[PDB]
Design a protein around this ligand. Structure first.
Ligand SMILES: [Cl-]
Ligand SMILES: [Cl-]
Lengths: 147, 134
């Protein structure tokens, strides 16, 4: 049974948390709900590196800027629903970079209530799946080629 | 310019494992672990914390890579490696591990941030593909 001793170092501080977020390989954004729209108030470097948009053209603009795919229209809709209800959700989407090139990404959204200011914020995690998708497709082709 | 609770939630929601470690003598001691790291390795936070990084069983095929990591850590340098590791239950996973040094002169010591991304599916798909060409 777990009678484990509770552990965590109280040496950890907000400076180290910011470095974890800066070092994260996945993109990490924070968003707020202003009326009917979703506004990005924080983005980490990975988000820039994956999407090609800078922090400053993104910040405090509606997230509609990241161009979606029509094959994802249903998933897009599931996301807005969960956002309105403050429920979490996860979806794999084909999105478009600033230069219009496509990337596949798994997007996972967690709502969080802030203790200092009582308002509801949502945390996105943006995982590039492009390489997994591309490998799975090559394998599918080779199955047609070989077998 | 961002709340300290919100950063923690960012780290907690992460899919990748995120740890902090500090050098202690000959050891690199893990002082923080996020939930994804618990799930990736199969160990709970309280069984991981304050143990040397070698608690997580490695592969003999990685001995060279581990040596590079030791060197980078001793020198306070970042490094990145793909390793085969084994969970608490003994199942294997491939993971890309990226280490970022951070100096706190406040603490008079260098902290290390690992990012541990499970690459297992990428590795096995790549291996299947290698066969299909034979
Ligand atoms: Cl739409
Ligand atoms: Cl494509």
């Amino acid at each position: 049974s777990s009678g484990l001793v509770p552990r965590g170092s109280h040496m950890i501080n907000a400076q180290l948390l910011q470095s974890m977020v800066d070092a994260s390989n996945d993109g990490i954004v924070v968003a707020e709900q202003e009326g009917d729209d979703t506004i990005l108030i924080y983005v980490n470097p990975a988000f820039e590196r994956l999407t090609g948009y800078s922090r400053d053209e993104i910040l405090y603009q509606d997230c509609r800027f990241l161009q979606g795919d029509d094959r994802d229209q249903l998933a897009r809709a599931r996301i807005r629903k969960a956002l309105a209800e403050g429920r979490p959700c996860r979806e794999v989407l084909r999105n478009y970079r600033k230069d219009g090139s496509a990337f596949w990404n798994e997007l996972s959204i967690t709502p969080v209530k802030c203790d200092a200011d009582h308002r509801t914020y949502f945390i996105g995690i943006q995982k590039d799946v492009s390489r997994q998708v591309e490998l799975e497709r090559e394998l599918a082709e080779m199955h047609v080629r070989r077998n």
